[PDB]
Amino acid sequence: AHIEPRYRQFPQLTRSQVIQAEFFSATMWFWILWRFWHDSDAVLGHFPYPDPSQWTDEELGIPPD
Amino acid sequence: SKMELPDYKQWKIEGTPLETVQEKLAARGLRDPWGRNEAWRYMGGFANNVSFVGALLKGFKWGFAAFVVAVGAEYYLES
Amino acid sequence: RHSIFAFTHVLIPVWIIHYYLKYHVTTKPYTIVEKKPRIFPGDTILETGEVIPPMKEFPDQH
Amino acid sequence: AFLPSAAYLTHQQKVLQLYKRALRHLESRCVHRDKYRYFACLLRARFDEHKNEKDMVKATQLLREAEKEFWHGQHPQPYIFPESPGGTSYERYECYKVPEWCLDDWHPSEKAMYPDYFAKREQWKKLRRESWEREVKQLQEETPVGGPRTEALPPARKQGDLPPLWWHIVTRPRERP
Amino acid sequence: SFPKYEPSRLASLPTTLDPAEYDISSETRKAQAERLAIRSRLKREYQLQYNDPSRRGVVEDPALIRWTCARSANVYPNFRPNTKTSLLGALFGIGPLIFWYYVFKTDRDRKEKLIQEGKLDRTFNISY
Amino acid sequence: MNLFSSLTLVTLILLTMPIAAINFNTHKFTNYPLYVKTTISCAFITSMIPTMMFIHTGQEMIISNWHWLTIQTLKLSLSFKMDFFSMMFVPVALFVTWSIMEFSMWYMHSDPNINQFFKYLLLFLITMLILVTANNLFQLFIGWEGVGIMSFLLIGWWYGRTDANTAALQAILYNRIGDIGFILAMAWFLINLNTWDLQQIFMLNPNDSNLPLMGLILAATGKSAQFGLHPWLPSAMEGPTPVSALLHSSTMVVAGIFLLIRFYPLTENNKFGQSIMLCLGAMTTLFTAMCALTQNDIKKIIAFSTSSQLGLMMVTIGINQPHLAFLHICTHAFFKAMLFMCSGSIIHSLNDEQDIRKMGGLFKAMPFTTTALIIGSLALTGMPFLTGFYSKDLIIESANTSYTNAWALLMTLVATSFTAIYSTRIIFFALLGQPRFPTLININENNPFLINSIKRLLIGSLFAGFIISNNIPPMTIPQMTMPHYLKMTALTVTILGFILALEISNTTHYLKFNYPSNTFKFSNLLGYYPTIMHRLTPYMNLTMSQKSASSLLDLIWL
Amino acid sequence: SWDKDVYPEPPRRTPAPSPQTSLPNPITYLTKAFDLLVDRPVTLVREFIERQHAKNKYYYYHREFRRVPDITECHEKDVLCMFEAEMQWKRDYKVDQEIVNIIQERLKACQQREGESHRQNCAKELQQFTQVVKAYQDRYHDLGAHYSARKCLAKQKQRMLAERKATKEAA
Amino acid sequence: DAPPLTLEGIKDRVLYVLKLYDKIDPEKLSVNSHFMKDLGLDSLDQVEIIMAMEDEFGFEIPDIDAEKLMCPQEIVDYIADKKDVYE
Amino acid sequence: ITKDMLPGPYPKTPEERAAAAKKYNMRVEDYEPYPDDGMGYGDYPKLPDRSQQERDPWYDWDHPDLRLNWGEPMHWDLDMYIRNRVDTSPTPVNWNLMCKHLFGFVAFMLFMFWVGETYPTYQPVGPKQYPYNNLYLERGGDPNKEPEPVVHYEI
Amino acid sequence: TFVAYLPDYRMQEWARREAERLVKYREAHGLPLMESNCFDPSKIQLPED
Amino acid sequence: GKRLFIIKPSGFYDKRFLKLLRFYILLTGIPVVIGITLINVFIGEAELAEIPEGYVPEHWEYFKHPISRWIARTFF
Amino acid sequence: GAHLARRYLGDASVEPEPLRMPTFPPDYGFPERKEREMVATQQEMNDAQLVLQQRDYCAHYLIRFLKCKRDSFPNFLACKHEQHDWDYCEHLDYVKRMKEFERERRLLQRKKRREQREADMA
Numbered sequence A: 001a002h003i004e005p006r007y008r009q010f011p012q013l014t015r016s017q018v019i020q021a022e023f024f025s026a027t028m029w030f031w032i033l034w035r036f037w038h039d040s041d042a043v044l045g046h047f048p049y050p051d052p053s054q055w056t057d058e059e060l061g062i063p064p065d
Numbered sequence B: 001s002k003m004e005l006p007d008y009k010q011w012k013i014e015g016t017p018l019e020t021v022q023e024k025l026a027a028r029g030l031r032d033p034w035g036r037n038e039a040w041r042y043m044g045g046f047a048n049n050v051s052f053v054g055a056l057l058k059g060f061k062w063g064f065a066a067f068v069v070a071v072g073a074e075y076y077l078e079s
Numbered sequence C: 001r002h003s004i005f006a007f008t009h010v011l012i013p014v015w016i017i018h019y020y021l022k023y024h025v026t027t028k029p030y031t032i033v034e035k036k037p038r039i040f041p042g043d044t045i046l047e048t049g050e051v052i053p054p055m056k057e058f059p060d061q062h
Numbered sequence D: 001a002f003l004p005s006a007a008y009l010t011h012q013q014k015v016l017q018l019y020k021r022a023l024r025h026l027e028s029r030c031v032h033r034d035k036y037r038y039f040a041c042l043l044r045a046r047f048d049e050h051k052n053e054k055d056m057v058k059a060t061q062l063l064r065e066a067e068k069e070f071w072h073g074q075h076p077q078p079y080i081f082p083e084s085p086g087g088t089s090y091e092r093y094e095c096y097k098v099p100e101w102c103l104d105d106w107h108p109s110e111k112a113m114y115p116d117y118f119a120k121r122e123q124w125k126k127l128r129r130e131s132w133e134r135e136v137k138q139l140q141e142e143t144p145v146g147g148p149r150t151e152a153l154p155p156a157r158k159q160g161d162l163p164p165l166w167w168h169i170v171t172r173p174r175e176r177p
Numbered sequence E: 001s002f003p004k005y006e007p008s009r010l011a012s013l014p015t016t017l018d019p020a021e022y023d024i025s026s027e028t029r030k031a032q033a034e035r036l037a038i039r040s041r042l043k044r045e046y047q048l049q050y051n052d053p054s055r056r057g058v059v060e061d062p063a064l065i066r067w068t069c070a071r072s073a074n075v076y077p078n079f080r081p082n083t084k085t086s087l088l089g090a091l092f093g094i095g096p097l098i099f100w101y102y103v104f105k106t107d108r109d110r111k112e113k114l115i116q117e118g119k120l121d122r123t124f125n126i127s128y
Numbered sequence F: 001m002n003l004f005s006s007l008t009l010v011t012l013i014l015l016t017m018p019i020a021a022i023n024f025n026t027h028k029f030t031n032y033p034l035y036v037k038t039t040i041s042c043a044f045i046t047s048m049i050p051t052m053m054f055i056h057t058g059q060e061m062i063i064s065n066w067h068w069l070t071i072q073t074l075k076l077s078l079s080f081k082m083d084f085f086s087m088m089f090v091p092v093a094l095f096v097t098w099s100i101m102e103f104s105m106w107y108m109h110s111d112p113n114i115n116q117f118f119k120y121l122l123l124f125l126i127t128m129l130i131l132v133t134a135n136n137l138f139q140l141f142i143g144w145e146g147v148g149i150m151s152f153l154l155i156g157w158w159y160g161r162t163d164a165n166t167a168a169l170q171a172i173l174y175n176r177i178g179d180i181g182f183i184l185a186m187a188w189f190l191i192n193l194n195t196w197d198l199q200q201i202f203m204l205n206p207n208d209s210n211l212p213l214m215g216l217i218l219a220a221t222g223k224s225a226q227f228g229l230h231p232w233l234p235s236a237m238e239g240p241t242p243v244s245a246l247l248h249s250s251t252m253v254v255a256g257i258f259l260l261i262r263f264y265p266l267t268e269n270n271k272f273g274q275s276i277m278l279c280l281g282a283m284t285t286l287f288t289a290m291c292a293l294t295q296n297d298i299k300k301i302i303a304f305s306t307s308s309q310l311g312l313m314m315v316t317i318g319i320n321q322p323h324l325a326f327l328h329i330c331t332h333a334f335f336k337a338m339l340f341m342c343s344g345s346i347i348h349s350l351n352d353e354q355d356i357r358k359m360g361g362l363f364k365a366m367p368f369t370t371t372a373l374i375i376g377s378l379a380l381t382g383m384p385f386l387t388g389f390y391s392k393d394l395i396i397e398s399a400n401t402s403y404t405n406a407w408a409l410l411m412t413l414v415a416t417s418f419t420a421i422y423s424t425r426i427i428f429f430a431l432l433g434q435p436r437f438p439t440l441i442n443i444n445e446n447n448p449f450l451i452n453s454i455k456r457l458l459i460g461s462l463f464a465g466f467i468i469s470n471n472i473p474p475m476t477i478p479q480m481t482m483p484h485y486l487k488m489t490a491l492t493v494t495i496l497g498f499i500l501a502l503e504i505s506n507t508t509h510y511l512k513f514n515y516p517s518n519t520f521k522f523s524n525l526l527g528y529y530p531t532i533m534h535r536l537t538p539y540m541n542l543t544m545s546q547k548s549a550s551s552l553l554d555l556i557w558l
Numbered sequence G: 001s002w003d004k005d006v007y008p009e010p011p012r013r014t015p016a017p018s019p020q021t022s023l024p025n026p027i028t029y030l031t032k033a034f035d036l037l038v039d040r041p042v043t044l045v046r047e048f049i050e051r052q053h054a055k056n057k058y059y060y061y062h063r064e065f066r067r068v069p070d071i072t073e074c075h076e077k078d079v080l081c082m083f084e085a086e087m088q089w090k091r092d093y094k095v096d097q098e099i100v101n102i103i104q105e106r107l108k109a110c111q112q113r114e115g116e117s118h119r120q121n122c123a124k125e126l127q128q129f130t131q132v133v134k135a136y137q138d139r140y141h142d143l144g145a146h147y148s149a150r151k152c153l154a155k156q157k158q159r160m161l162a163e164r165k166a167t168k169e170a171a
Numbered sequence H: 001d002a003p004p005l006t007l008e009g010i011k012d013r014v015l016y017v018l019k020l021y022d023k024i025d026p027e028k029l030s031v032n033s034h035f036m037k038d039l040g041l042d043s044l045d046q047v048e049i050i051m052a053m054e055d056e057f058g059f060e061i062p063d064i065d066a067e068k069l070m071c072p073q074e075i076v077d078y079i080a081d082k083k084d085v086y087e
Numbered sequence I: 001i002t003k004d005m006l007p008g009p010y011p012k013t014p015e016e017r018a019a020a021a022k023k024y025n026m027r028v029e030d031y032e033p034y035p036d037d038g039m040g041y042g043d044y045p046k047l048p049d050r051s052q053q054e055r056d057p058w059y060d061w062d063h064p065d066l067r068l069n070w071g072e073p074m075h076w077d078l079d080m081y082i083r084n085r086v087d088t089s090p091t092p093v094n095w096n097l098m099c100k101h102l103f104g105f106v107a108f109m110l111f112m113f114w115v116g117e118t119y120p121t122y123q124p125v126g127p128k129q130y131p132y133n134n135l136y137l138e139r140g141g142d143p144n145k146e147p148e149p150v151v152h153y154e155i
Numbered sequence J: 001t002f003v004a005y006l007p008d009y010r011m012q013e014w015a016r017r018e019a020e021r022l023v024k025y026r027e028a029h030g031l032p033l034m035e036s037n038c039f040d041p042s043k044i045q046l047p048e049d
Numbered sequence K: 001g002k003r004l005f006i007i008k009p010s011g012f013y014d015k016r017f018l019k020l021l022r023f024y025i026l027l028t029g030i031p032v033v034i035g036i037t038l039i040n041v042f043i044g045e046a047e048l049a050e051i052p053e054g055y056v057p058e059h060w061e062y063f064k065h066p067i068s069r070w071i072a073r074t075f076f
Numbered sequence L: 001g002a003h004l005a006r007r008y009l010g011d012a013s014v015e016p017e018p019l020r021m022p023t024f025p026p027d028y029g030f031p032e033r034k035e036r037e038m039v040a041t042q043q044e045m046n047d048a049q050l051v052l053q054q055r056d057y058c059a060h061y062l063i064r065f066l067k068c069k070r071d072s073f074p075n076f077l078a079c080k081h082e083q084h085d086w087d088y089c090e091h092l093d094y095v096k097r098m099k100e101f102e103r104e105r106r107l108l109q110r111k112k113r114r115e116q117r118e119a120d121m122a
């Protein structure tokens, strides 16, 4: 039996469409939290970005004259 | 062939935003004649719709649950 | 007659196109030109039998 | 302005049309339903403030600057109904609205596929052709000298007759073929 | 007060903001009634032929025939060569021809001078 | 070798077989749309094997199988180029088209010309895979004009409607203005390089290649709806929903971007072409995203979305990152086809209602449609580790860290915020809140065709960026070192767009009525660009086509 | 097949299959399924067709044109000899066109076959292509649509006057 | 999709709208109740009722017809004309 | 059709104007021709240049797509003012205001891209360094000549 | 069927195969693949100056 | 129930033309395709060979396909 | 990103321009500076068909990673550490580019303070 059209009220819902929609919403947040738990660097950062001012003049070769 | 329409005596605008609209209209002497026509949008199964942060977080409860299940499964599997 | 789709639409065209490419296209010069496969240090060549030597030892960083 | 029956718009019609267009463009401005319903009663109050204006020249001027108010406050893309002109589904099925006379051009092998339909269509056409000369001689004695003044047509007066100029209005295609 | 709407060639003034739409005078009643009368008479003359069963063909529209005869036939026998017609037939008639003539002649003289001086890169140019 | 080229040609011949079936018909069909959908599913399965054996070794080839013409130095052969671009585009296009046709078996079920519709949609697919596999400019021009003409025939599907014919002729006009530049490029390569083949173009490697690249940029402007030649892509929403889903979001409109990605060894040695592509792409991705902020038709909003994503593709070509642009094409196809499918599911459920101001309350009425629309919007905006994260964010991670036009970067970031703005605008006016549609609810989505068709592109929109970006080889070096305010750029700008548009949406519940601002009138009437030029440029043509051309000169004087 | 000198193919170097992971790839199974289901029946039908080719062996020949006198040693306005010269010149024109097409096929196949190292590894084919295009341009460019042996001879004579004047002005 | 409209359905829906209107009492409302003369409404109220019909059934009634619909039976007959009911 | 319903020369006398306005089926007061400069319009009525998009859509038309009636004297450019073509309809924003906003927006975006091309943004790095004499043999260098040494050093 | 099996319409195929002779004749004998002069420059008398 | 008649123009003459078009094309299409298949299978493609000493070939003996040899011999 | 403000709003005399630098010798300030060693042979990255943008001073990690990517089919997640090695050494190459940039900026500061010392003294 199909979904009957209704008037000025909430339409009929199937159990299957609701559990599939909740299942794919859970799949979205599962995959987001999973790849955020394992990678954590594609969003935040892979390697440290060094400070240029914190480098010494000997490794860069600046003789003071 | 007949679609049996519901009652027109159950669409009352108390407890709705039409209540607020009729109060603010009667505050300056105005009266709202099409409110009970609008009353079905704000009651029943269409009442209490989620916000945007609640529409985003659909499934996040069970998704975080299965996430913690899989993290516990790999942590008890790695040893 | 349950899977006649994979016979009429796939398998007989694979026969036709394999006959066409095997006996009419590749029998003519430069029609199917293929990029030569990617050779790495450590590989073994099938046409010759020659083992490619590895790279230089690494000045390790970590 | 441009109408089939009247040659103009009465001031009452102009007021009602401006009120309707103001409410429609307002609903376009004011998407939510309770919010539009609040502003709709406010705008109804603004229109009923000068409902009882006797002076037609003063009401003409008030209507004119009301048109200026409506033009200053209009929405750029107002809500047009889908099958309303300017809508997204407007005149969509006009490519499916085949005129009825094309059934006359069918081959008899496919006319015989629907025997009751064309067997009834024969007496529909019979009805039309024995109604035509009676409704022509109806229209020729009621139309004034110089042609008809207005585009409206008289109805069927005698019992047994049909209203004049009726075949394309009755046998028009459905809006969803 | 409010910004007045500016009409244009491609942006006409609305029916609502035109003042002459709000004429109430009896001569406007006469003009509107005569327009309604001509339109109703032409509508009746059309749909007596349109709803006729004995006619099976084309209800010929002499306004359409008159429009096509104006767009095709009436162009030459109502021409008078004067200052306006001759100057406008000399502007858009021999103007852009001279324009593209000097543009293409200039570019081809430049290209020929570069080729006979060995300048133009005509290396792999063997299709022509 | 004998597997790769064979199944490559079997895919295209298999796509052409239902055209012979529909042309050799006498009976009334035993579900010809199911036959075409089954055929395109099997063509997807067939094209999967050359893609997998490309991911195994990197195996590219050319099939110059049929000699067609020899104009004295130009041997035009039927030549198919199976490279990385074909091996990643053909399974994505066949997968998306398979979902679009299972969608169309539900959506286009009331149409009595359904066999003509599936025929035209298959003809589009054939011309598009002629385009993306062509090895010379002539076969690419065949596929190019083919997708232009099938665009005409699928915009003007309801040919009785005046607006559909108008939009179709508009799209043909702007595409032929792009074809001016495409034929300019063909003319330049034939005269200066004696070839239309890609291999001789790439091997000769010309240096004075400003003029053919300007021709190719004009071609991509006409084809991918870049600024100046853009408005036909919003006009082209007058066609049916699976037309706008397949053709004008994900498959046809990437072909100007694909034309510029295809010619990457010329663009990587021409900085001027890169700068012009960067400026034009930033202009388009600003303008169309700004126009999307104040629209109310949902098909118009998602068309401005896909044109802003095409402008971003033009941006990331313009920073000399073509493979990231093509990864963004393959990524963008999934969620943008799914967003058009979910919008049209709302449209067909709400009885041809497309205006978002008469929607709402569909979070619990259409749950699967709401789920997939939220997932498509979040993949569009750059939610972390959806498919749209695996390309678009990297685009920003190369748009910041490169020798770049600074204003193009700033407009790229403003576009990145605007994507979040119109995405949560769609979710606000269409899914959230209280209902605004009329009273006779016929809301329903429980057809396995609709649910499975959105489901497979949902699996794509969740997993396909991860799968593809871990299956494609490196062709550039990914710039992975940047400061933390520069790494967190795209995410923070996207969340700022969400916050700003949520404040905008919560200013609409207030009981205030403001007069319209000039920014609202500008963005709502589409930068005033389709209002002026669609009136002025025809006028100055047609009077000049009548007064001086016909009447004055060629009937009287001459 | 064809002649491996005019269409040169360098010796192929494929690497050996080196399976590192334990998961079986689909490509070997699909290759065996293609070898059984597709290669064998096509090969059997081709053997049947080739037996039927052997049941009637007959040959065709490549037509040869012996060299007639060219336009230089034909008298002026003597159409019987300069017709022969023109036919010879046109056959050589079409053959020179196909020589250019062969060198283009070489260059395109070299570029694809070398892949990304095409600029390093196809210098000789690009050099041959530059020489044959310079030769074809010096021989047949700018003649027009009504080209003939006389136009080609006059272009050769103008080029030889230019080369002689360039030799003279260098000394 | 697209459910068929009936004169019982169009009648019951038009009367269902007019019974949710605070200037029309639900006990005097009939199928032939004239808006100006029998229910005592304004032309402004009549325009609001035709706009409520437009809100109800999802299409537009033009103004040359909206200025003349003066009973619920005329509304049901006009929607019967513009929707082709009882095939 | 016959001759006395066909167009003719320019109306000079008012009775020829009345005969034409009866011929063109319209009022004599509305009937104005194109001005007799010799451009060959003849006695055709100068309609006031309204696009057919502007018309009443809900009106019962004889030609619904054209929004045109039978016997109505058409516009001279009726092929031009169809709804598939040139429109003259009123717009919410003024015409010159649209042209000013469009020109200012387009020219200002062009000027800002010129400013950003004048001042380009980059990274605090040196140039990318490649081995083997800036990859001389890879970038198409000839094997017989030897370039200058391109040597990069550790840092 | 007639046009498809035309016997080498305007001797194109021959001209390829002939080229496949001549290149093979002058790759092997070390000659250039095409001379810059269509005719022999020894049998040509230029106008002197 | 309540099936509705769809007014449409006569699709008999267009379908009759297309049936006749396909029939009168296939009427000599199918014998020509079967005959070309039988020639390519049984009569088969000729082989390139050097011109022998003293053997002057006919003009139709310079072509590969048998139908091309038939055309060059019979008509040309 | 602050150096863009230092070069545009400040002076471009002390900020090293991106297009042509180093403007200083490589031995200037470095006693016995050594070259950059290339690990992968020219013929080895020739046969590996690497992109000309990818044949930098650390392409040998890329060759090992691509050999792992070919050999681990279909398990496309089995060579994360080889990609990590290549990305980390590209990161170190970018750090060396940053060190060259900071060297050039500090030697231009040396030149600026040198001419200011000369204008103060002489």
Ligand SMILES: CCCCCCCCCCCCCCCCCC(=O)OC[C@H](COP(=O)([O-])OCC(O)COP(=O)([O-])OC[C@@H](COC(=O)CCCCCCCCCCCCCCCCC)OC(=O)CCCCCCCCCCCCCCCCC)OC(=O)CCCCCCCCCCCCCCCCC
Pocket: C015, C016, C017, C019, C020, C023, F009, F012, F013, F016, F017, F020, F065, F066, F126, G041, G042, G044, G045, G048, G049, J001, J004, J005, K026, K028, K029, K030, K032, K033, K036, K037, K038, K040, K041, K044, K045, K065
């Ligand atoms: C088929 C009937 C259809 C219905 C009838 C009506 C048809 C239409 C009427 C037409 C009337 C005539 C019109 C004029 C044309 C005349 C013919 C002609 O000029 O032919 C030209 C041309 C030249 O042929 P030729 O000069 O006669 O011979 C060439 C050889 O030198 C010499 O030949 P060969 O000796 O090398 O080859 C001999 C060949 C015979 O020759 C022919 O077939 C040639 C004649 C066919 C011409 C057909 C033309 C009609 C139109 C065809 C296309 C449309 C068809 C309908 C739609 C299809 C779907 C789209 O032998 C075979 O076919 C046998 C092998 C079969 C292999 C397949 C099966 C193998 C496994 C079997 C297993 C079972 C048994 C196991 C046990 C065995 C025990 C012993 O022939 C063809 O083109 C043949 C058609 C097939 C070509 C390849 C098709 C695939 C290509 C794919 C890649 C390229 C396209 C990419 C597209 C991308 C998407 C857009």
Ligand SMILES: CCCCCCCCCCCCCCCCCC(=O)OC[C@H](COP(=O)([O-])OCC[N+](C)(C)C)OC(=O)CCCCCCCCCCCCCCCCC
Pocket: C016, C019, C020, C024, F065, F066, F067, F068, F069, F076, F077, F078, F079, F136, F138, F139, J012, J013
């Ligand atoms: C169900 C249908 C299939 C047929 C079933 C029955 C037959 C069984 C299958 C076996 C078939 C027979 C054997 C194989 C076919 C013959 C092979 C062969 O050598 O044929 C000779 C030739 C091969 O070419 P060629 O190189 O030998 O000669 C070309 C001719 N000259 C040199 C004069 C220029 O022809 C074909 O193969 C014809 C088929 C081509 C397939 C593609 C057609 C596309 C048409 C598009 C038109 C417009 C093109 C525009 C684009 C151009 C490029 C930019």
Ligand SMILES: CCCCCCCCCCCCCCCCCC(=O)OC[C@H](COP(=O)(O)OCCN)OC(=O)CCCCCCCCCCCCCCCCC
Pocket: F163, F166, F167, F170, F173, F174, F177, F180, F217, F218, F221, F227, F228, F229, F235, F280, F530, F533, F534, F535, F537, F538, F541, F542, I083, I084, I085, I086, I087
């Ligand atoms: C990367 C480089 C970028 C360079 C950018 C600058 C160069 C390009 C400049 C812009 C050119 C295109 C814009 C102008 C013409 C647009 C015409 C058009 O699209 O008309 C559409 C119009 C209907 O539009 P619309 O009003 O939306 O309709 C729906 C409701 N009526 O439809 C109609 O009115 C129908 C009209 C039919 C007849 C058309 C007549 C005009 C033809 C214009 C040809 C232009 C050729 C340009 C050639 C350039 C060569 C270099």
Ligand SMILES: *C(=O)CCCCCCCCCCCCC
Pocket: F400, F485, F486, F489, F492, I121, I122, L001, L002, L003, L004
């Ligand atoms: C100097 O600022 C280097 C960074 C690149 C140029 C400036 C980019 C500014 C915009 C991006 C960061 C925005 C953070 C909210």
